[PDB]
Design a protein around this ligand. Sequence first.
Ligand SMILES: O=C(O)c1ccc2cc1OCCOCCNc1ccn3ncc-2c3n1
Length: 337
Amino acid sequence: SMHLICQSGDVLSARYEIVDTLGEGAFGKVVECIDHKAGGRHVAVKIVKNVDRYCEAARSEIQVLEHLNTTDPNSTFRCVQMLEWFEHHGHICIVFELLGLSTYDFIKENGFLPFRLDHIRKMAYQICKSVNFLHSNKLTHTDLKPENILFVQSDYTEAYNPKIKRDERTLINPDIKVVDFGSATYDDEHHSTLVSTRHYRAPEVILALGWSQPCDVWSIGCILIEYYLGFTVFPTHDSKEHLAMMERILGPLPKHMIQKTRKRKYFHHDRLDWDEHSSAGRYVSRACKPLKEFMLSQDVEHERLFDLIQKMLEYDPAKRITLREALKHPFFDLLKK
Ligand SMILES: O=C(O)c1ccc2cc1OCCOCCNc1ccn3ncc-2c3n1
């Protein structure tokens, strides 16, 4: 019955009038509303499916946000502000401040073109700062991806560009906020075996080795690559293929992780069980290639970004760079006076 309560013109809680849908998901949807009790200002309302797994996640999200918005009332660390929550026809609804497009939707609407490097540098710094704040408060997000990173303002200028014979959108302000804390997990809570959206999922997660803050760093690495290229480098829906893609881009998995995993089905004699001359094998070869071959320039600033990404995509989570270290990386030197 969600379709029946989330339409343009419906009024929620005698207050919020739905204008349009901002996004949809397995969880339910996010709608833009007019808040008639706050003078007509626009807000985002997340309407959660009335299904146990999503109700529990929504309840968990509300606890996490109460904590974060109380610790950082000014959003210095750029987590979205929750304004309130309520029930509407048995559905949990969470009201948030209204932001601009997700970084994913902006890329999508721009024909899957990447962001400019100077924007990426600022967005990356802000993502690392925001998530590091979570890591400093004993939390792991677990579901970082471009859909969950939103521009504060997604306005852009638009010009014909000769170089690419097409109209192109240039983002005006690249400031972001991090959203979606429904999967966020405290150090002392139960760690679900499966986390992250596949394309952003860390190798310790796929291998069911246990996970913790470093899995977020992996996700951020995947995000930065997508921002740079305009597409994901792990476009797959299959775990084994995904691991094969990693292997082509980053080299072989560490032995000790292969030996430790309970997912035997991927391996044979401690090597990935993957015929590189199969149909899917030839695809993985011709489409994927070593990480640095994706660089669009040899200019040092590009090299600095790729050095950071490479450190974020370290297989062994115990060795993977932390966000505290990442914030001091040379890629960010240009942001400092
Ligand atoms: O899960 C939350 O905590 C969440 C909170 C707020 C918003 C979205 C959220 O969900 C995931 C993102 O979905 C992208 C859809 N597009 C837009 C566009 C503009 N806004 N402004 C706030 C949100 C929003 N979503």
